[PDB]
Amino acid sequence: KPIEIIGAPFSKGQPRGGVEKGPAALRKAGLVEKLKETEYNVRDHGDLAFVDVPNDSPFQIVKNPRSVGKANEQLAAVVAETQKNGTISVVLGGDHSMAIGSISGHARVHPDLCVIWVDAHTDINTPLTTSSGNLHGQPVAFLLKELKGKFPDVPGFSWVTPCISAKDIVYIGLRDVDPGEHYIIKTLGIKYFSMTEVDKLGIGKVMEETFSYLLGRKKRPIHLSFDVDGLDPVFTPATGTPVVGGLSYREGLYITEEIYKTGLLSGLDIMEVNPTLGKTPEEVTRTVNTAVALTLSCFGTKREGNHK
Amino acid sequence: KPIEIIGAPFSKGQPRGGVEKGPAALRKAGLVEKLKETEYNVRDHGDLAFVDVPNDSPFQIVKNPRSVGKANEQLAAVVAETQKNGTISVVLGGDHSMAIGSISGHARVHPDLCVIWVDAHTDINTPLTTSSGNLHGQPVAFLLKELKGKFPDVPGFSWVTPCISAKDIVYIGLRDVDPGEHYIIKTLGIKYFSMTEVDKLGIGKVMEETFSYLLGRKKRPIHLSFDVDGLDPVFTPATGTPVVGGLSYREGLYITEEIYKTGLLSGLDIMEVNPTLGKTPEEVTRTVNTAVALTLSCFGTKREGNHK
Amino acid sequence: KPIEIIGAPFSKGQPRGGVEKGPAALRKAGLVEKLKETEYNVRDHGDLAFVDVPNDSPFQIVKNPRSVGKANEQLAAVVAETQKNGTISVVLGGDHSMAIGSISGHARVHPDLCVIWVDAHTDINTPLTTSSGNLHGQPVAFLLKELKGKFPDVPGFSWVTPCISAKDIVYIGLRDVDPGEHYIIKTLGIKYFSMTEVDKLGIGKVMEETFSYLLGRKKRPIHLSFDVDGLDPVFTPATGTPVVGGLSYREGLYITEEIYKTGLLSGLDIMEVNPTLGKTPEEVTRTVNTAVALTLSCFGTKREGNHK
Numbered sequence: 001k002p003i004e005i006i007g008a009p010f011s012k013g014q015p016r017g018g019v020e021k022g023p024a025a026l027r028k029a030g031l032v033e034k035l036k037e038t039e040y041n042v043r044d045h046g047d048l049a050f051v052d053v054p055n056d057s058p059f060q061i062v063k064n065p066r067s068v069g070k071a072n073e074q075l076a077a078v079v080a081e082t083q084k085n086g087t088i089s090v091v092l093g094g095d096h097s098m099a100i101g102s103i104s105g106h107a108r109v110h111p112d113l114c115v116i117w118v119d120a121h122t123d124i125n126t127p128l129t130t131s132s133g134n135l136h137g138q139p140v141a142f143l144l145k146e147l148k149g150k151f152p153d154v155p156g157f158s159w160v161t162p163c164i165s166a167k168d169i170v171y172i173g174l175r176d177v178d179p180g181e182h183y184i185i186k187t188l189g190i191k192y193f194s195m196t197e198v199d200k201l202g203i204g205k206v207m208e209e210t211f212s213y214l215l216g217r218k219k220r221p222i223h224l225s226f227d228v229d230g231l232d233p234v235f236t237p238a239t240g241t242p243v244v245g246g247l248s249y250r251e252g253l254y255i256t257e258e259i260y261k262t263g264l265l266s267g268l269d270i271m272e273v274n275p276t277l278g279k280t281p282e283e284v285t286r287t288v289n290t291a292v293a294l295t296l297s298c299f300g301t302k303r304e305g306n307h308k
Numbered sequence: 309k310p311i312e313i314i315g316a317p318f319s320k321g322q323p324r325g326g327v328e329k330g331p332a333a334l335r336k337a338g339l340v341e342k343l344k345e346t347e348y349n350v351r352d353h354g355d356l357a358f359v360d361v362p363n364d365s366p367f368q369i370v371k372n373p374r375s376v377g378k379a380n381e382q383l384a385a386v387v388a389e390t391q392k393n394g395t396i397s398v399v400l401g402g403d404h405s406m407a408i409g410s411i412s413g414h415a416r417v418h419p420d421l422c423v424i425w426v427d428a429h430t431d432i433n434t435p436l437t438t439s440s441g442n443l444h445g446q447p448v449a450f451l452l453k454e455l456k457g458k459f460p461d462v463p464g465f466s467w468v469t470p471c472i473s474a475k476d477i478v479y480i481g482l483r484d485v486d487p488g489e490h491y492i493i494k495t496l497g498i499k500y501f502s503m504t505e506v507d508k509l510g511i512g513k514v515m516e517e518t519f520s521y522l523l524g525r526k527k528r529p530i531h532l533s534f535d536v537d538g539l540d541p542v543f544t545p546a547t548g549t550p551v552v553g554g555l556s557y558r559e560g561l562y563i564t565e566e567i568y569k570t571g572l573l574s575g576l577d578i579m580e581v582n583p584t585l586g587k588t589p590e591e592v593t594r595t596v597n598t599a600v601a602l603t604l605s606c607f608g609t610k611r612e613g614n615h616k
Numbered sequence: 617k618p619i620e621i622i623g624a625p626f627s628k629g630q631p632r633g634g635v636e637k638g639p640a641a642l643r644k645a646g647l648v649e650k651l652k653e654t655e656y657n658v659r660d661h662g663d664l665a666f667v668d669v670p671n672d673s674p675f676q677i678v679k680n681p682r683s684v685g686k687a688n689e690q691l692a693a694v695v696a697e698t699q700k701n702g703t704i705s706v707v708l709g710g711d712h713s714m715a716i717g718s719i720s721g722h723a724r725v726h727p728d729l730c731v732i733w734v735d736a737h738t739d740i741n742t743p744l745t746t747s748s749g750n751l752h753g754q755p756v757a758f759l760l761k762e763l764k765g766k767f768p769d770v771p772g773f774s775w776v777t778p779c780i781s782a783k784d785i786v787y788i789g790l791r792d793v794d795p796g797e798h799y800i801i802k803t804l805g806i807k808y809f810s811m812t813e814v815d816k817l818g819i820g821k822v823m824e825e826t827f828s829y830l831l832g833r834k835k836r837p838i839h840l841s842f843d844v845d846g847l848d849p850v851f852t853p854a855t856g857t858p859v860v861g862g863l864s865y866r867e868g869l870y871i872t873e874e875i876y877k878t879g880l881l882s883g884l885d886i887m888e889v890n891p892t893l894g895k896t897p898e899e900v901t902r903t904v905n906t907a908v909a910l911t912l913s914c915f916g917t918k919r920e921g922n923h924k
């Protein structure tokens with residue numbers, strides 16, 4: 001089984017443009033080289049050439065709808081094509097709005113996949129509940145079967161088909177959820193482990209519980225959408241929406257080590273790394289290196305060591 | 309059920325006077341506004357006008373006995389009056405010596421209440437075991453039935469009646485206990501979870517265990533006396549007696565979230581916040597904001613989110 | 617039962633010479649005074665006078681073989697002599713290469729002892745697997761019965777006899793293990809709790825599990841070899857080989873508190889403290905004080921308090 005890195009230098013899912021540099025900063029930290037030292041064969045697609053839409057007025061409150069919807073249609077066609085060739089897609093972001101295209105394309109080939117969304121946010125606001133309009137806080141909304149028809153058709157997303165149900169996803173890290181989002185997860189009954197559940201159970205029992213909940217009936221492809229701001233700002237400071245009291249460095253590596261060991265990882269997203277959001281140069285380095293470490297962990301590297 | 313904020317700008321329980329500014333710094337951080345956004349109706353009594361006692365020589369080694377004993381007699385009459393009107397008292401301190409008056413008044417209306425004392429210290433030295441004389445490290449001593457008559461009558465505290473027994477309180481966070489205090493808790497058999505027990509069990513099992521121990525027989529009013537230095541100096545640096553290896557931000561919010569969910573919180577203290585003890589302006593901001601967050605957590609705010 | 621502090625100002629087990637100052641920095645922090653306040657009688661042997669070997673060319677890749685092998689032969693004779701007099705040896709290092717002599721001498725008197733190696737590294741590279749040649753990352757190699765004859769005879773270590781088997785040791789803290797080391801621990805089946813197992817189980821269950829594994833059949837002398845870089849660089853920054861995502865201050869004290877409570881501690885090492893590796897003066901102070909605290913914890917001091 002081979003790996004396929006797909007760079008997604010996109011930022012129109014939020015205000016700050018530095019995220020577009022996430023793919024390159026991750027590559028400069030030696031990501032591909034290090035991944036080639038693991039047990040997998042690594043292929044590097046390169047970065048996607050995102051087509052900008054000049055005339056892109058806000059859809060009501062939704063901003064850059066057409067630029068975002070197009071950028072994701074491209075990504076979805078590339079992930080599906082790589083998934084079609086039996087390779088594990090590894091998407092390096094921009095903003096988390098790229099998960100729409102990452103998961104959509106993936107679910108075309110493995111419609112039975114489940115989603116492990118690591119984030120301090122649920123990113124499940126719809127065009128009608130969002131208060132900012134930033135589409136990086138709405139991906140989950142465009143992906144859920146149950147939320148289909150709950151908001152008006154957004155320009156640029158006609159190609160989108162909600163093919164993943166609320167029972168196929170688990171959240172880990174939540175600590176900053178909007179009122180509408182909380183209402184949505186409770187009504188639809190989306191499984192989650194906010195920081196409260198992590199403190200209550202411990203990361204160990206948390207992973208055991210998300211696997212039994214998602215892989216209890218039958219084993220299936222796993223799509224991990226890791227938002228760097230899932231970890232505490234002390235570890236991943238270079239992100240546009242840091243929330244205090246998050247997952248630790250250790251807890252993050254635990255999550256990935258466990259997903260690795262399942263043997264089911266099929267798709268992976270490393271989102272929201274913004275190399276221009278460091279208070280100090282070292283804060284950017286600390287963030288990048290942590291993202292690279294989490295990515296490697298997903299593909300073999302264990303803290304107990306490794307050997308051939 | 310309504311909430312009642314009672315400011316207690318008192319500092320004569322220890323050396324440093326900045327604590328008297330704790331109530332105002334907490335209000336400046338938007339405490340009342342934020343509390344009014346929760347599901348409770350919030351009333352703000354204001355700050356107590358503490359009568360200073362000019363001639364207040366040390367009782368043996370005890371300092372400012374009369375000023376402290378008077379200040380607490382006032383507070384006790386106000387908390388009892390608010391408790392008498394079916395409202396939840398929320399006392400913002402100074403030093404922890406104000407817990408004597410906070411709990412005493414509370415126990416007049418709910419003599420069946422239990423106490424969850426979150427602190428890095430036991431604050432159970434008596435006038436005869438204390439080595440500093442600072443009454444903020446002796447409140448528990450003036451409140452316990454079993455410790456009545458174990459030390460001579462201190463001027464200013466004649467109004468005090470030890471109405472809470474050693475079996476009604478649980479400690480969480482302990483990591484700096486004096487020899488006499490350790491002897492006292494072991495002889496009286498006061499339940500506690502020092503940092504050792506938190507590391508052993510995990511905060512989750514710790515709360516489950518203090519609730520079963522205190523609310524096992526019958527459910528009763530809970531009085532939470534939270535000492536800001538209960539959390540690690542990394543979170544609550546602006547306190548006069550910080551000890552390393554304390555509760556985390558996450559663990560602190562867990563404690564309050566769980567007390568909230570019990571539906572039994574009857575009285576609350578937010579003590580030892582000293583807005584003049586910050587190494588840097590941000591350390592003061594970090595401390596205040598954490599105290600405000602813990603207070604809000606006690607009244608509804610959950611990390612998983614909320615909605616109407 | 618008495619305690620015996622044996623200073624081991626040695627650094628030839630690695631590049632940086634500051635470690636030779638570890639014993640003195642620890643004494644300057646008031647170690648002996650504080651240890652004399654515990655329930656034990658404390659004896660201070662002083663620092664060993666290490667004989668330097670002028671002509672000491674690398675054995676193949678192994679550096680300072682003869683200087684290290686001699687320094688440890690001395691230490692082994694002193695620890696065995698103190699162990700012979702029924703006292704608990706407390707060796708203050710330099711580099712971890714001194715554990716060879718510390719444990720060897722100890723095992724002469726208590727050949728039934730088990731080893732609790734707290735470190736971010738396994739220090740089990742042999743003269744043929746090591747890539748650096750630094751003997752502080754090879755002690756365990758010269759001590760294991762199963763690894764006898766697996767590498768050529770190193771000058772300076774003829775006196776060495778591997779008397780401890782792979783089933784008598786448990787590792788805690790691992791997060792930076794070499795390929796050969798990982799192969800060695802898995803083939804020999806050495807018990808370990810890397811950071812992954814600590815996150816999975818919690819430090820509490822981790823200690824319960826190492827005690828049942830090592831003291832299940834019969835109770836026996838415990839030799840704790842604590843490498844300061846076992847804790848996160850945030851607590852013990854002044855070490856030559858810091859790895860991120862390590863044990864916390866709390867977790868470290870937990871380990872020692874539990875070993876204390878077993879009543880079986882027979883030998884103890886406080887290694888890799890380098891008072892010249894502080895980014896700032898406070899980082900050195902933070903490291904020393906943490907090492908002193910861990911040492912005291914091993915001899916009585918509990919976070920819940922103490923009394924006579």
Ligand SMILES: N[C@@H](CSCC[B-](O)(O)O)C(=O)O
Pocket residue numbers: 095096097119120121122123125130131132133134136137178227229241272
């Ligand atoms: N609640 C926020 C969502 S911020 C989420 C950002 B990120 O993609 O990093 O999770 C909103 O409505 O914009």
Ligand SMILES: N[C@@H](CSCC[B-](O)(O)O)C(=O)O
Pocket residue numbers: 403404405427428429430431433438439440441442444445486535537549580
């Ligand atoms: N053991 C100390 C008590 S310091 C406690 C301070 B605080 O109120 O913050 O817990 C003494 O005798 O002054």
Ligand SMILES: N[C@@H](CSCC[B-](O)(O)O)C(=O)O
Pocket residue numbers: 711712713735736737738739741746747748749750752753794843845857888
């Ligand atoms: N893997 C390293 C070992 S570094 C271990 C250092 B210390 O003694 O602190 O554990 C090597 O071959 O030099």
Ligand SMILES: [Mn+2]
Pocket residue numbers: 096119121123136227
């Ligand atoms: Mn996100």
Ligand SMILES: [Mn+2]
Pocket residue numbers: 119120121227229230241
């Ligand atoms: Mn996020």
Ligand SMILES: [Mn+2]
Pocket residue numbers: 404427429431444535
């Ligand atoms: Mn206190």
Ligand SMILES: [Mn+2]
Pocket residue numbers: 427428429535537538549
């Ligand atoms: Mn305290």
Ligand SMILES: [Mn+2]
Pocket residue numbers: 712735737739752843
């Ligand atoms: Mn070592």
Ligand SMILES: [Mn+2]
Pocket residue numbers: 735736737843845846857
């Ligand atoms: Mn080490």
